[PDB]
Write an enzyme that holds these catalytic residues in place. Structure first.
Site, PDB file in Angstrom:
ATOM      1  N   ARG A  71      -6.561   4.213   2.546  1.00  0.00           N
ATOM      2  CA  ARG A  71      -5.922   2.903   2.621  1.00  0.00           C
ATOM      3  C   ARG A  71      -4.857   2.782   1.531  1.00  0.00           C
ATOM      4  O   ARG A  71      -3.668   2.954   1.808  1.00  0.00           O
ATOM      5  CB  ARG A  71      -6.967   1.793   2.508  1.00  0.00           C
ATOM      6  CG  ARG A  71      -6.404   0.379   2.617  1.00  0.00           C
ATOM      7  CD  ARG A  71      -7.528  -0.643   2.616  1.00  0.00           C
ATOM      8  NE  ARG A  71      -7.027  -2.016   2.619  1.00  0.00           N
ATOM      9  CZ  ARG A  71      -6.634  -2.669   1.534  1.00  0.00           C
ATOM     10  NH1 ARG A  71      -6.610  -2.088   0.350  1.00  0.00           N
ATOM     11  NH2 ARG A  71      -6.245  -3.938   1.644  1.00  0.00           N
ATOM     12  N   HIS A  97       0.825  -1.212   0.000  1.00  0.00           N
ATOM     13  CA  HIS A  97       0.000   0.000   0.000  1.00  0.00           C
ATOM     14  C   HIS A  97       0.858   1.260   0.000  1.00  0.00           C
ATOM     15  O   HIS A  97       0.772   2.118   0.883  1.00  0.00           O
ATOM     16  CB  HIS A  97      -0.957   0.023   1.194  1.00  0.00           C
ATOM     17  CG  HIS A  97      -1.855  -1.167   1.273  1.00  0.00           C
ATOM     18  ND1 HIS A  97      -2.683  -1.397   2.348  1.00  0.00           N
ATOM     19  CD2 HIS A  97      -2.062  -2.190   0.411  1.00  0.00           C
ATOM     20  CE1 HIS A  97      -3.354  -2.517   2.151  1.00  0.00           C
ATOM     21  NE2 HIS A  97      -2.997  -3.017   0.983  1.00  0.00           N
ATOM     22  N   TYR A 139     -18.987   3.693   2.894  1.00  0.00           N
ATOM     23  CA  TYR A 139     -19.934   4.481   3.665  1.00  0.00           C
ATOM     24  C   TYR A 139     -19.841   4.120   5.141  1.00  0.00           C
ATOM     25  O   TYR A 139     -19.411   3.024   5.512  1.00  0.00           O
ATOM     26  CB  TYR A 139     -21.368   4.251   3.183  1.00  0.00           C
ATOM     27  CG  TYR A 139     -21.541   4.518   1.718  1.00  0.00           C
ATOM     28  CD1 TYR A 139     -21.682   5.820   1.237  1.00  0.00           C
ATOM     29  CD2 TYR A 139     -21.512   3.476   0.801  1.00  0.00           C
ATOM     30  CE1 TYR A 139     -21.816   6.068  -0.119  1.00  0.00           C
ATOM     31  CE2 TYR A 139     -21.648   3.715  -0.557  1.00  0.00           C
ATOM     32  CZ  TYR A 139     -21.805   5.006  -1.007  1.00  0.00           C
ATOM     33  OH  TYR A 139     -21.931   5.223  -2.360  1.00  0.00           O
ATOM     34  N   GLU A 197     -18.212   1.016  12.502  1.00  0.00           N
ATOM     35  CA  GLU A 197     -18.075   2.287  11.799  1.00  0.00           C
ATOM     36  C   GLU A 197     -18.850   3.388  12.518  1.00  0.00           C
ATOM     37  O   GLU A 197     -18.369   4.520  12.648  1.00  0.00           O
ATOM     38  CB  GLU A 197     -18.541   2.135  10.349  1.00  0.00           C
ATOM     39  CG  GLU A 197     -17.746   1.091   9.562  1.00  0.00           C
ATOM     40  CD  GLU A 197     -18.172   0.973   8.107  1.00  0.00           C
ATOM     41  OE1 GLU A 197     -19.391   1.054   7.821  1.00  0.00           O
ATOM     42  OE2 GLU A 197     -17.275   0.792   7.248  1.00  0.00           O
ATOM     43  N   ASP A 212     -21.838   2.784   7.255  1.00  0.00           N
ATOM     44  CA  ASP A 212     -23.086   2.037   7.185  1.00  0.00           C
ATOM     45  C   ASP A 212     -23.127   0.787   8.060  1.00  0.00           C
ATOM     46  O   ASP A 212     -24.169   0.125   8.104  1.00  0.00           O
ATOM     47  CB  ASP A 212     -23.385   1.636   5.726  1.00  0.00           C
ATOM     48  CG  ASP A 212     -22.230   0.885   5.058  1.00  0.00           C
ATOM     49  OD1 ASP A 212     -21.303   0.418   5.752  1.00  0.00           O
ATOM     50  OD2 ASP A 212     -22.265   0.751   3.820  1.00  0.00           O
ATOM     51  N   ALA A 227     -14.837   1.790   6.215  1.00  0.00           N
ATOM     52  CA  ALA A 227     -14.610   1.355   4.843  1.00  0.00           C
ATOM     53  C   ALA A 227     -15.839   1.720   4.015  1.00  0.00           C
ATOM     54  O   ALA A 227     -16.933   1.207   4.261  1.00  0.00           O
ATOM     55  CB  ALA A 227     -14.352  -0.146   4.765  1.00  0.00           C
ATOM     56  N   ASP A 250      -1.383   3.532   3.315  1.00  0.00           N
ATOM     57  CA  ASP A 250      -1.266   3.251   4.741  1.00  0.00           C
ATOM     58  C   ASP A 250      -0.175   2.220   5.055  1.00  0.00           C
ATOM     59  O   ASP A 250      -0.103   1.743   6.191  1.00  0.00           O
ATOM     60  CB  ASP A 250      -2.623   2.794   5.308  1.00  0.00           C
ATOM     61  CG  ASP A 250      -2.991   1.362   4.929  1.00  0.00           C
ATOM     62  OD1 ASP A 250      -2.300   0.743   4.085  1.00  0.00           O
ATOM     63  OD2 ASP A 250      -3.975   0.852   5.522  1.00  0.00           O
TER      64      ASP A 250
HETATM   65  O1  LIG Z   1      -9.658  -8.962  -3.859  1.00  0.00           O
HETATM   66  C1  LIG Z   1      -9.253  -7.900  -3.335  1.00  0.00           C
HETATM   67  O2  LIG Z   1      -9.924  -7.167  -2.571  1.00  0.00           O
HETATM   68  C2  LIG Z   1      -7.839  -7.450  -3.655  1.00  0.00           C
HETATM   69  C3  LIG Z   1      -7.126  -8.054  -4.681  1.00  0.00           C
HETATM   70  C4  LIG Z   1      -5.847  -7.577  -4.963  1.00  0.00           C
HETATM   71  C5  LIG Z   1      -5.103  -8.160  -6.135  1.00  0.00           C
HETATM   72  O3  LIG Z   1      -4.642  -7.368  -6.981  1.00  0.00           O
HETATM   73  O4  LIG Z   1      -4.986  -9.413  -6.188  1.00  0.00           O
HETATM   74  C6  LIG Z   1      -5.297  -6.528  -4.201  1.00  0.00           C
HETATM   75  C7  LIG Z   1      -3.938  -6.103  -4.487  1.00  0.00           C
HETATM   76  N1  LIG Z   1      -3.653  -4.914  -5.121  1.00  0.00           N
HETATM   77  C8  LIG Z   1      -2.302  -4.823  -5.381  1.00  0.00           C
HETATM   78  C9  LIG Z   1      -1.736  -3.646  -6.109  1.00  0.00           C
HETATM   79  O5  LIG Z   1      -0.564  -3.745  -6.528  1.00  0.00           O
HETATM   80  O6  LIG Z   1      -2.482  -2.653  -6.255  1.00  0.00           O
HETATM   81  C10 LIG Z   1      -1.700  -5.967  -4.906  1.00  0.00           C
HETATM   82  C11 LIG Z   1      -2.720  -6.783  -4.339  1.00  0.00           C
HETATM   83  C12 LIG Z   1      -2.483  -8.136  -3.728  1.00  0.00           C
HETATM   84  O7  LIG Z   1      -3.395  -8.608  -2.998  1.00  0.00           O
HETATM   85  O8  LIG Z   1      -1.399  -8.706  -3.991  1.00  0.00           O
HETATM   86  C13 LIG Z   1      -6.111  -5.995  -3.176  1.00  0.00           C
HETATM   87  C14 LIG Z   1      -5.646  -4.887  -2.247  1.00  0.00           C
HETATM   88  O9  LIG Z   1      -4.423  -4.580  -2.251  1.00  0.00           O
HETATM   89  O10 LIG Z   1      -6.516  -4.360  -1.513  1.00  0.00           O
HETATM   90  N2  LIG Z   1      -7.347  -6.447  -2.914  1.00  0.00           N
HETATM   91 CA   LIG Z   2      -8.851  -5.320  -1.384  1.00  0.00          CA
HETATM   92 CA   LIG Z   3     -18.881   0.805   5.435  1.00  0.00          CA
END
Ligand SMILES: O=C(O)c1cc(C(=O)O)c(-c2[nH]c(C(=O)O)cc2C(=O)O)c(C(=O)O)n1
Ligand SMILES: [Ca+2]
Ligand SMILES: [Ca+2]
Ligand SMILES: O=C(O)c1cc(C(=O)O)c(-c2[nH]c(C(=O)O)cc2C(=O)O)c(C(=O)O)n1
Ligand SMILES: [Ca+2]
Ligand SMILES: [Ca+2]
Ligand SMILES: [Ca+2]
Ligand SMILES: [Ca+2]
EC number: 1.1.5.2
Lengths: 452, 452
Positions: free
Chosen positions: B228, B144, B271, B309, B273, B269, B163
Site C-alpha cells: 500500500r 502513497h 494477516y 481476505e 484473518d 490488510a 499504490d
Molecule cells: O490514522 C491513520 O490510519 C492514518 C493517518 C495518517 C496521518 O498521517 O494523518 C495517514 C497519512 N500518512 C501520510 C504520510 O505522509 O505518510 C499522510 C496521511 C494523511 O492521512 O494525510 C494515514 C495513511 O496514509 O494511511 N493513515
Molecule cells: Ca492508515
Molecule cells: Ca487482515
C-alpha cells in the site's frame, strides 16, 4: 488463518495419488522414519515396539521392544521419541524417549517419568542393546507429552516436551509450567519439573550444551519455552527448525523455533491478538470446585482469574508463522448447528507432526520448500509452502488425502513421489459432511500414496 | 498486535534521553542520512533541497536543490528517494527519486512521473552535478508515493513505490494495481503503470537485474508486490530486508521482504484473518456516486463488491511480522468515545520509516537487534526487538519520545548514543489525552535525542 469449511475439506480427495495400505494391524503407531538402511522404521506407542518395513515388498520385522514402557489406555504416554544418529554407519545409535515408572515419585497421580535413552544397534543380531539413560526424571503425565526427538545439524538432540496438560481436564488445577525455568540449585539436584512446555537441546550424552540460551539467568537444557503440545519438529536443508503445535479450542501453530525464544503458552495462544482466547488460570482460582466452561477463556465461570494476551508481561515472545486456526471473540465454541459433539467444528486441526518435503528426482510438481503437517481431527495431510529460505510461509495450508482417518505422521520416499503415513488406532475424526465419527477407515495402519 | 491505549502512549516520555531541537520550520523535511563526511544530510520534499547540517553547531548549508521538482500543497509528492553510494570515497554518487512533469502523459488528472536519478557529488565545488536518469516514467500521484531508496549489499537499488492512493479518497474509483505486473509488451514499451504498490530492485544503471524474480512469467524491476504505502525499508547486518508500511484504518505492517513475495494488498490488510478489514473494490462499483463508508470494508454502501481476505485467490502471500494494529470485525471505526475526529482513534500508527539500529561504541543498553519505526499519528518512535538472526520480532512495539509531533524519519549516530529525528511541518497528531490536535510542538524539525 481462517478455518476451511467442511465442504472445503471434503473436496481435498487427492485424486492424483494411488492409495495402498502396507500394514493394517498396528497398535497405536506413532513415529515414522526413513532409515539409514533405506527401510521404513516405525514405533508402537503403547507396546514399545520398534518395527522395520521393507518399502518395496512390505515385509516387516519387530526389531526391538522397549521394556517396561508405561502407557494408559486414556493417555498419550508411552514410547515417544525416536531418531537415528546421523552418522549411523560409524555411530550405530538409536535415541528414544519413553514413559517409565519413577521410583522416586511421591505422587500417586503422577507416578511416572520420561527418559531420553540411547540404544546401540547390533547389525549382526538385528536388535538393540546396551541401553543408556541420557536424561531421566523428566515430567510425565497422560496429557500433552509431545516427545518429538530429532538430531540437528549441530549434532545436538532437540526434544519437545509438552505442558503435561496442566490447566485443562484432569490437570485443571495444576499451575502450568510452560513459562517457568529452573534455578541453578534445581539443575544441581537434577530437578527438571520446569521441563514442561519446552524444546530441549541436549548434548548426545544428555549434558547441557555450553552455548544453550539463558533463561532467567540460568543456562539449562531448555532451548525454547512457552509451548503447549508441540508434536512436530523438523529441520530444513538450510538449518532452520520448523515446528507444529496443538493449541486449545483454537490456534494450532506452525512455528519457527529460534534459540532462546518464548512461544507464549499459556498466556498467548497463537498471535498476541486478544482474539478467541484468553488465559484463565484455574490453579489461581481460590475455589477448587470452580468449573471450566471450556469456551477457550473468552467466557468463564466466576472465580477464575483471566489475563488477556495483551496484558501479559512477556520476554522474547515469538509469534507463529501460521495458525490453524484463529477466530474472533464472537466465535461460538458451542455451535449447535455442528451437532452434539461441538468440538468437531472447533477452529483447530490437531497437527500430529511436521515433515520437511525434500523432493527428489520424481519430486511432485509445485511442492518445493513445503512442510507436510498431518491432521488428526480433520483427516487430511496439510501442505504448507514456504519461500526457498524457509523464512516465511506462502499462502495457506492446503489439505490433502481427505479420509475418515486420524493421520499421525508422514514421510516421503527419497525420489519424492511416494508418501508414507501412519494412522491412529482409534479416536474421533471429521467426516466429509462435517460431523464426527469414531469409525476410522484404516485404524492403526501404514499407508502409502503414490503420485500417478 | 493489539492497540495501546492513550494512557499507554502518554507515559512513553523517554526520560532517559536529552532533547535538543537543532532546526525547525524546515519545508516538509522527509529523509535524513548520516553522510560520508559524518555530517547530517536531509531532504525537503516540497522544495527539492538537499541540506547538510553540522551535528555540533547546527550550521546548515543548502548543498543542492533538485530542479523542477513538482509538489502539491496537499500532496505526498515531491523529492522522495535519497541515498549515498555505499563506497562513496571511490563512487561519490547520490541517488534520488522525485516527482517531475511527464511531457508525454495523456491524462490531465495524473500529469507527472517519478524519476530515479543519479547525481555526482563534487567535493571541490561542494554541490551536485552531472545528473543521469536511471528509471523514468514511473507512476506519480498525490497519494502513497512511498519512495524509499536504499542500496543493498548486492549493490542493487531497492526502491519502494506506493499504490498511488487508488481505492481511497481522491482516487477512490481508480483500480488498484498493487497486485498487477507488466506484460513483456509493456516492458518493451517502458510502460510502468503496474509499478504501483511494489518494491523494485534495479541495477545501478537502472536496468532490470537478470536475477530478479519472475511474476506471471515476466522478469521486470519488480522484486515484491502487494504493498500500500511502504515508507520504511532497511537492510539488516546479515543481509535481510525489513520494511514498514501504512495500512488503511488498520493493519500498518512491519514486513520481512523476500524475493518474489506478495504482501497481499489490497486483497489482504495485515494477516489473512478476516479481522477488521475486507477488500471493497470501488473501481468495480455499479456507479461512481456511491460513498465510501470508511469502515475499512467491514460495512460498505450498496453496489461495491467486497472480497474477504480468505476469499482471495493469491500466490506467494507473505504475512507481516507485526501489525500496528489488528482489531476485531466488531471494532467501531466511528467510535464516539473520541470527538468528531474519529480517525485519530483508528487502530493505526502511520509508520513513516524503518531504521535498523546498529549500535556502536556507545550503544544503548538493551537495543541490540532493534528496528526503529517513527509514528506520524501517535507522536512516538517505536522500538521493535528482533532475535539476533533478524528472523522474528520479540514481544511488542515499544513506544518512545511521546510528543505532539509527527515523526517522519530517524537515524542514529555511529557511536549509537544519539538519535536524529525529523518531524512534519503540518498535520494531525494524537495528544496525551487521546484527542487530536494539529498544533505540532516542533514543526518541520531536526531533533537530537542523546542518551543520558
Ligand atoms: O490514522 C491513520 O490510519 C492514518 C493517518 C495518517 C496521518 O498521517 O494523518 C495517514 C497519512 N500518512 C501520510 C504520510 O505522509 O505518510 C499522510 C496521511 C494523511 O492521512 O494525510 C494515514 C495513511 O496514509 O494511511 N493513515
Ligand atoms: Ca492508515
Ligand atoms: Ca487482515
Ligand atoms: O479439536 C481439538 O482442538 C482437538 C482434538 C484432538 C483430537 O485428536 O481429538 C486433540 C487431541 N490430540 C491428541 C493427540 O494424541 O495428539 C489427543 C487428543 C484428544 O482430544 O484426545 C486436541 C488436543 O490435544 O489439543 N485438540
Ligand atoms: Ca486442541
Ligand atoms: Ca505459541
Ligand atoms: Ca491469540
Ligand atoms: Ca501486507
Amino acid at each position: 488463518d481462517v478455518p476451511l469449511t467442511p465442504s472445503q475439506f471434503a473436496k481435498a480427495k487427492s485424486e492424483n495419488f494411488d492409495k495402498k495400505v502396507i500394514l493394517s494391524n498396528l497398535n497405536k503407531p506413532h513415529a515414522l522414519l526413513w532409515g539409514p538402511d533405506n527401510q521404513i522404521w516405525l514405533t508402537e506407542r503403547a507396546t514399545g515396539k520398534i518395527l522395520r518395513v521393507n518399502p518395496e515388498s512390505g515385509s516387516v520385522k519387530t526389531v526391538f521392544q522397549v521394556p517396561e514402557i508405561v502407557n494408559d489406555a486414556d493417555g498419550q504416554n508411552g514410547l515417544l521419541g525416536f531418531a537415528f544418529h546421523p552418522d549411523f554407519k560409524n555411530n550405530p545409535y538409536i535415541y528414544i524417549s519413553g514413559t517409565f515408572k519413577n521410583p522416586k515419585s511421591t505422587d500417586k497421580e503422577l507416578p511416572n517419568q520420561t527418559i531420553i535413552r540411547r540404544y546401540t544397534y547390533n547389525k549382526s543380531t538385528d536388535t538393540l542393546e546396551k541401553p543408556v539413560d541420557l536424561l531421566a526424571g523428566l515430567p510425565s503425565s497422560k496429557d500433552h507429552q509431545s516427545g518429538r526427538l530429532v538430531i540437528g545439524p549441530d549434532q545436538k538432540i532437540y526434544y519437545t516436551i509438552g505442558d503435561q496438560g496442566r490447566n485443562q481436564l484432569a490437570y485443571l488445577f495444576l499451575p502450568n509450567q510452560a513459562q517457568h525455568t529452573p534455578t541453578q540449585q534445581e539443575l544441581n539436584g537434577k530437578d527438571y519439573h520446569t521441563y514442561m512446555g519446552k524444546v530441549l537441546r541436549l548434548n548426545l550424552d544428555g549434558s547441557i550444551p555450553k552455548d544453550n540460551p539463558s533463561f532467567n539467568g540460568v543456562v539449562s537444557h531448555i532451548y525454547t519455552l512457552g509451548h503447549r503440545n508441540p508434536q512436530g519438529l523438523a529441520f530444513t536443508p538450510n538449518g532452520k527448525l520448523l515446528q507444529s503445535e496443538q493449541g486449545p479450542n483454537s490456534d494450532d501453530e506452525i512455528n519457527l523455533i529460534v534459540k532462546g525464544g518464548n512461544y507464549g503458552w499459556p498466556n498467548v495462544a497463537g498471535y498476541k491478538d486478544d482474539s478467541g482466547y484468553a488465559y484463565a488460570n484455574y490453579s489461581a482460582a481460590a475455589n477448587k470446585s470452580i468449573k471450566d466452561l471450556a469456551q477457550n477463556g473468552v467466557k468463564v465461570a466466576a472465580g477464575v482469574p483471566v489475563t488477556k494476551e495483551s496484558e501479559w508481561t512477556g520476554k522474547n515472545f515469538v509469534p507463529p508463522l501460521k495458525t490453524l486456526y484463529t477466530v474472533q471473540d464472537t466465535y461460538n465454541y458451542n455451535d449447535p448447528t455442528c451437532g452434539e459433539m461441538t468440538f468437531i467444528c472447533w477452529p483447530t486441526v490437531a497437527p500430529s507432526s511436521a515433515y520437511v518435503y525434500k523432493g527428489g528426482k520424481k519430486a511432485i510438481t509445485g511442492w518445493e520448500n513445503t512442510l507436510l503437517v498431518p491432521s488428526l481431527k480433520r483427516g487430511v495431510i496439510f501442505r504448507i509452502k514456504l519461500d526457498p529460505t524457509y523464512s516465511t510461509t506462502y499462502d495457506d495450508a492446503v489439505p490433502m488425502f481427505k479420509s475418515n482417518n486420524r493421520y499421525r505422521d508422514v514421510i516421503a520416499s527419497p525420489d519424492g513421489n511416494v508418501l508414507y503415513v501412519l494412522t491412529d488406532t482409534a479416536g474421533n475424526v471429521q467426516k466429509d459432511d462435517g460431523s464426527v465419527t469414531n469409525t476410522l477407515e484404516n485404524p492403526g495402519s501404514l499407508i502409502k500414496f503414490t503420485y500417478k
